[PDB]
């Protein structure tokens, strides 16, 4: 089997991407944030504290003839941006782009933090990291991909995120029309539960490539590119007037700037992030200070190849017995 679903930016900055997901019988379609950095499929629901729901579409398990309470199971998760959610668990039928899993754990939120409430466009998350990170207790649950894998034509999914445009998540096949040149594959460590890999270096604009190993994670649920302070300083030094602002919470730059590209290495291959992808717009409405899309990972504890990086590539998440990651230009 295979599946193919369009993923759409939630706003004009590509702050996140939402993908429609069918849950239950009859189908209830929710728009979920596919997150290769976590491993829980959770939704706003009829159980979510009413004051914490503001415009989201909810899953109502009592209206699904295939929903079953997973008795005694609870979940609770916190994300790198400080947001969080928790609740109980149902199993139900879940379909993405025509690919159906029966008995998928659907984690129903009883509580969500303010950042979730405030984002009316995101109805929940669909985790695509390794199932070892799943938070359900006392019986850990599998991700949608893990459940689907054996049925797929090939044990893979691909992320093809758009810049200020829709893109695609495919399950079970590689669309050879969706990228240019060849796909370069690179080793993955699953030791921390992430799609963790090592970039071979970077370049800023038309500058020379610096060969240096940068361990980090491919994370579709993180907006920006978080890299070591040395790398980030080298980038922003090429933008007149750019500076790190403790009050704003990262590097800012004059909105009048033209940003240089940023290249990262995948083995001997190179992925080029155009400068425009690094512009996250005014820090506040009407400001002439703009927020940068490349930020320091110092104090995160891990480097994160978030959407800024991934949307410059066609990315293969190869879930074969020994997982690997593939990157192609597009």
From Swiss-Prot:
Active-site residues from the entry: 35, 199
Positions of the Peptidase A1 domain: 17-328
Give me the reactions it catalyses.
Hydrolysis of proteins with specificity similar to that of pepsin A, prefers hydrophobic residues at P1 and P1', but does not cleave 14-Ala-|-Leu-15 in the B chain of insulin or Z-Glu-Tyr. Clots milk
Which chain regions cross the lipid bilayer? Answer: none
GO molecular function terms attached to this record: aspartic-type endopeptidase activity
Question: What are the annotated disulfide bridges?
Answer: 255-290
Kindly state which keywords UniProt assigns to this record, in alphabetical order: Aspartyl protease, Disulfide bond, Hydrolase, Protease, Signal, Zymogen
Q: What does the record give as EC number?
A: 3.4.23.22
Would you kindly state one Gene Ontology biological process term found in this protein's UniProt entry? proteolysis
The Swiss-Prot or TrEMBL record describes its family as follows: Belongs to the peptidase A1 family.
**Name the record gives this protein:** Endothiapepsin
Q: Which organism is it from?
A: Cryphonectria parasitica
Name of the encoding gene: EAPA
Portion of the parent chain present: 90 to 419 of 419
